[model samples]
Target: NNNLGTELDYDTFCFYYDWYGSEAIDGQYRHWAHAIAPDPNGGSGQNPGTIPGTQESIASNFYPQLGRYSSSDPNILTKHMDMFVMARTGVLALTWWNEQDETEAKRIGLILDAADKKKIKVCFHLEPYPSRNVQNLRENIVKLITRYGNHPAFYRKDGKPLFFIYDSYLIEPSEWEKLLSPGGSITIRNTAYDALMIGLWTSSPTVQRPFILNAHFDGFYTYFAATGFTYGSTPTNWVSMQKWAKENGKIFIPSVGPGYIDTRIRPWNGSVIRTRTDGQYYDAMYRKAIEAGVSAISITSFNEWHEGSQIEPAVPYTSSEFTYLDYENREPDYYLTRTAYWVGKFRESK
Candidate 1:
């Protein structure tokens, strides 16, 4: 662990993580072999678009040092845990899709176990699963807590589990109220299923007013790395969001990333690409988040390679189909080094 550096404030920062499968473990490639052009119309299906191959044509501008490893691999998980400790973001917001997918759940359990060894906590980033209404969400939470609640690495704040609901805006606020509001018909408040439910903020505060005022979400976090693509993702608006959260007795968590470049998957999204600028992008975002004086911060990703937003080590790589991006003239762990330094700075100011 010393190779990474001293640990920073665990409560102050969290990182987003993606769980992917590979042929070595799952008998087929999962996210690593995504289509070059994902269908604009979303569903569980992948259209006839060109799919990235094993290692050479993977749907990512940057290549992973681990080289398309499985999520359940012990060595890979251990290395990621080390990187997490190095970054000093003690919490991992692991993406979760379906509660009934035992394969996925098993991998998550392995992650929790590995993270526990490094004293890193794990929280669920609930994806918009099929039939994801209020009742189904409650059921999903119940299943998650029932299975992984006893694990030491299951992250909690003030004795309640924490869940980050991605694409939370998809569900109407009135529907959320039925579960989150205090006296609602099927509220989880003050119950065994109670949690610190954090939602995504993609629009302006006025547009998201109902999520705060009526739905009773405990907090909000900006998930996208494209600065200005949305009102919430823009750092300039974070201070106001934080202030608004405080005035309403809630928390606002700002998310930052090294950069964004998912054109390999979404070939038409080149315009929104954000350059790493030899870590300058990350530095500026962190500085702004600190200035916002928010309660906590979340890193957009630890290994979201598709968007080129990962801080995980990546070496220069080339293939017949693509030439991968790498940290400019810096070591593969440059981001981790910078993250540790910024974590120290955030700790000092906090």
Candidate 2:
């Protein structure tokens, strides 16, 4: 396959994981986010893993031996820094969903260490504000940017650092303006940093149309589905989004999912569906994304077995016949290889 010209770029591959254990074994690393509170009964009833009265537990019974990797662990920090260097992933969107102040600092330290070595960009998946106290949010934003904004790993668009918001609708239109206002932005501390806002929704024409009229973002990313999840975004949705971005002279990053069937961690009562296409079907989706001329692409996950949308190398614990050394033993390779093939082909065309 020929390389796409310099003008064409492949979406950087990223994995999302909650902070639970040490850096991923082998060459992998999870984009670590906040820890979940433990359940009292350890997750029962509809929440089979819930612990009852307390907060949801971050500890996974499935991997009990793996201790939570703390910032104090030099070995763990070194491993993570090394992995990001080798992966050459330009961005690490740290998952900070509902995290308190102390935990946030620990995670930020990990990112700073990695940025020093790999120059990986760092961003956070911020929880949506449900109220209009945009001032408080702005204060927190300033603190974060003031501390880490200068790191080489920070992401930038049009010479401004970038921050990603998980829910755009959390703030009303009027509140959003205040948050994005020049002198008192709730995200980046300085005007130097731009915002890249994203939201979770199944692909639909109605869901995406408003992005064009909205004045808040440099680009938009839509969630294809939860890990091990599946939903269809019609060709019409893709075409419409493409048209909107083109007309507004903005960049659009299309989200793609391989398949999702996470009955282990979460309940699966909706419908039994095969969201992943086999070989050819999967390739065709990449073809569509490439044809759309998107500036960036994000896969559903890197290692989310509980949600079943992982692209990580499969482990031997799942099956004895499949050894860790054997790439063919892992089902995700089929999807990854096909993705690589199409991405290579697409880039070459440019």
Candidate 3:
């Protein structure tokens, strides 16, 4: 109800959020200090990224204003919640690796608490962790739901939690049916663990259609940021995807991103660089999603800086070894404001 006079579409708009940690709060840098791969593009003798093996050096092409902040920091959590309030985004798809990870368990607890206060709903973005088989996924879902499903901030619609499974295509549909299908053995349907599962659509429709058809996924979303990277990610294909979803009695959530540039991590992958072009790229993607008549849309990120797809605030930063990308002369929160504007349009369409 305290949405700054704007009615945010909680069921329609969601942002992907990462809850990884840094050295200051977690006792050691986790995701910030990543191994730099040797340049695959002609093996450039010199490293193009920030100097390796230091806290200042990160894997992202863009620098966050918070500067490798810890996911456990309450102050940072408040700031993120404030940004969502200002941006008018209603739901957050927080990344969840597994239930066994102690750090993730602790951080998610803190996030859920803060989100409860801010009136923001939190959903899980199920990652493909090591040894993630059918049994493991079943236990993980039960464990997580039993732990957090009763929380006030936990996202649920029509009495079921929602999960976005990244790279869900890895698992065979036969296995997934055991959990998802209504009549299959060990099915969660109509059970306490029943949830709305959204799977990632990566390849072209012809290649990936059978998986969605048979996997018992309640819906599908295009997760990649690069426009032409895959058939599902391309905006032009969204209308057909939407139609297909409607015809098949499934959900269609078209994911949008500000831009993408991950050269710092994988120097060889330069062909998919999507420049922000002063926010025009984001605007175009939103327009396409709305025109496609999607009932819901997913933002690629709020702080996935490595992909340069984050809508979180970033500052222009430079070090002797590397220079970070910024929001092209716009304010630090330019993307947040832009997102709010698009959200308004999307709501008006409804």
Candidate 4:
């Protein structure tokens, strides 16, 4: 009987960093009290989104009890780390776009500091930036390791540091081969720059698995958990995906989530909605991944409140002031407790 390994990680779902205010990532606030405030494009994020309110004909979804907190705030970071550790999610896949985006970088430092105090590990969620190429990839890895490799909170897998790439589809597989695969232009297979790398293969009907295989990635992860969003990430596909991974000796990280609701941001993209179903959906996803004997499970998010995929604590609120989803007749920490339960089950399953 094979046992589950006690390791976990996910992209910090750190979009909240840039949406706060000009210096939101610097532990400062701008109308941080309004459940849905105005977004000021922020200090350093190219993707810094805007804040919102309950105008007659607009709004994405429900509001957050934390009310868009400053990501760099020591108290907020401490509370989040405690919650994450409580749920047994010891790794934080911090989303990083580029070295120039110092706002998120500053916030990442705070997350690392908070995680270090609670036995949590931190890894990079390498986001797609303009002009990111194979050569730039090498430079970015060097920058990451040179700046933070010595930190005790750095996440490592297979005796090497780890990094998850989001929307890696921007770069062609052939190009990735140059850096990730051996015998290529900029191979890092045996170098200190080599990392336990995983790329986001969100979903597809075709045998897109080969895309990552050909890309020279060590493994692949499903970033979206809303079952119907992508055929490849469905619960049933986990078995096939993990089986192939095991056969090929690669890592398989199938992300699971409570639900999804990103209508707040994407007004035109409303057809994709997945209900929580009182946590049954989550149970099924986790059970399937467990049954598949996955090497690791990447949660879709821990605090992506904007998309309603967050497992962080949220309070029940009226539909007005701001429309947001709560536990609905349950305690504020329902999702967190449920996550703890699933994690315990995974740990106890042998």
Candidate 5:
């Protein structure tokens, strides 16, 4: 929690796909096959957990159960939504992998309901495709904005709607401007919508910040630990990027991942080992991040069980092999307490 508190005034938490819709409807599991081969068991397949060029494998036998939002089942959407809102998270970042559709609209509405009740900020992830059909893309954005734009939970920057883009470089600059132009029939630009571009390797030593600066984006975010960069090992590179953004007067949001190791599937079973990060070490990292003077701090994730970056309370039903707290086996409150302490210290520094 100290990791999140130092950087962000609000917590940008995430809820995965399973929390909304179930994997299985009735007794059968619903799995989508990508370019990779099909599973041998004919059951649902799981993702290779963000590792590139890896094949999907059946890691676990359990599947998500389908039910209405108001269902009385244990895994119902309403139950999870209620729990999430009650967690006191300042912001709820919804996880939507692909494009926006009717199903996504319903899910957004559910989130909006929760945001309204808790007065939390609501944001969703977008994967922009410059090569996709322009008409389809415009239509999707229009539909989304039309539905959720008016919600109070939707964040705004420079008097415009704020959308988070997962990969900014993948989309063509010219095409993006064209699609978001005020004259376009889609009318999102006319309505004054802006985007917050977040990329995977923006903080890598080889990456150039000029592209993002030239594009006039609201802000840019990079995965700190996920980029194989650490505060202790590459303090110069880490500090340089932060200093550059601050010098340029640009918005740079620093992200920190507790640690990443996923061994649920084959090939990666023993390849990825869990690394421990204590509160003191994390507090030091947070101090470094503050020195960078980032506009905000976005913790890599709140509950990414597959990637093992969750800060949520780990109940017995979630993971038996691992406990939620670190070395002390502390409660969730301990994490939050430490977070508040460091955050207060950072604020005092300012």
Candidate 6:
């Protein structure tokens, strides 16, 4: 592991690191540019806009400062890594579609290099890709370990590698047993493929506990940036969930976002906007997360502008295409500054 260096050294993590801006560093952004425009019945896109990068998103979510920049830009990557450190984040939960994601997979090295430069950890937020199953997971894990496991930025929790899986319910727990359970049908226990597995909490705390243990997962985390979305992500629910996790020897990583306003992006879901309240919402969630006294906390995003939950710096934007939100009189670095405060408090307690 020394060969990888000591870059990944923090404790708190952020969940989003979107690279959809073709206009910036990556050179090409096929996903963001051609993303399916939001429908009138959606959050906001009465008419879809093919953003610079993807087919599934809109131009409305672009950061005002970074303005559709490329993610592959070494300069931008360095800037972002510095921001993560500024925010006091120990780990960055990169949104990777999967191993076969030829485009994004290629960018992993750059992320690791940047993270290494800052001494921050990199963990995977394994997206639900097409045809993903236990076998695919096994193969992906093998490849991850074989190819990138040695990287210093690759996260290791309590000496065990950590991986967070989204939409784990896509496959049945019985099926997941084959790959993760110690004695499943095709178990790969005691091998390099085995690591600390955390699944998304898309269900009740009590119910999720059973599924988590049944699947041989190490624990569960809530991935939503918005509150009131589910019992798992809700700040109030963490008290009980953390209690459950502690009692059952599991991990409870609750996610907190600044606010959510995707109406411009998902016009249909506009009614559910969570106002940022000039950072009030974020502070409230941060207080609760720390109060819960859990193992670690996760920010909903570092930058996922499409959902309006990015903590990355932003500026006031006024576009004919779509009006965006800003820090509202505060410095553009408001969120980053706030995150640093919480990170200090979090580390002090941890």
Expressed as tens digits, the lDDT of each residue in 1-350 for candidate 3 is 46454755586545555555666788765566665567655655765543242545777888888888877888889988888887878898888776566777778898999888889999988898988876788888898899998899998988889899998988999999998999878888888899999999888888667889899999999888889898899999999999989999899888998999988877778898999999999999999999999888899878887778999999988876678889977899999888889888888786
Better of 4 and 6 by lDDT: 6
User: How well is each residue in 61-80 modelled by candidate 6, as lDDT tens digits?
Assistant: 53447656667767778989
- Model 1 C-alpha lDDT per residue in residues 112-225, reported as the tens digit of each score: 999999999999888998879999899888988998999999988989998888999889889999999988788999999999888888897778866667878999888887
Candidate 5 Cα deviation (angstroms), residue 281 = 5.3
TM-score of 5: 0.66
Candidate 2 per-residue lDDT, tens place, 151-240, comes to: 766665556555455555555545655556454345443454345544433344464445324434555665444322322243335556
- Per-candidate TM equals 0.94, 0.68, 0.93, 0.84, 0.66, 0.89
Q: Cα deviation in Å at residue 50, candidate 3?
A: 9.1
Indicate which candidate wins on TM-score: 1
Deviation from native of the Cα of residue 65 in model 2, angstroms: 14
The lowest-lDDT stretch of 10 consecutive residues in candidate 4 is 9-18
Backbone clash count for every predicted candidate, in the order shown: 0, 27, 0, 7, 2, 35
Winner on TM-score (4 vs 5): 4
Q: Please report the TM-score between candidate 3 and the true structure.
A: 0.93
**Which parts of model 3 are misplaced by more than 4 Å?**
1-5, 12-19, 38-55
- Cα displacement (Å) at residue 163, model 1: 0.6
Off by over 4 Å in 4: 1-60, 99-101, 203-207, 319-321
Once fitted onto the true fold, the runs of candidate 1 whose alpha carbons sit more than 4 angstroms away are 1-5, 12-15, 38-48
Positional deviation of 215 in candidate 6, in angstroms?
Answer: 1.2
Ranking by TM-score: 1, 3, 6, 4, 2, 5
Between which residue pairs do clashes occur in model 5? 2-339, 23-64
Q: Rank the candidates by lDDT, best first.
A: 1, 3, 6, 4, 2, 5
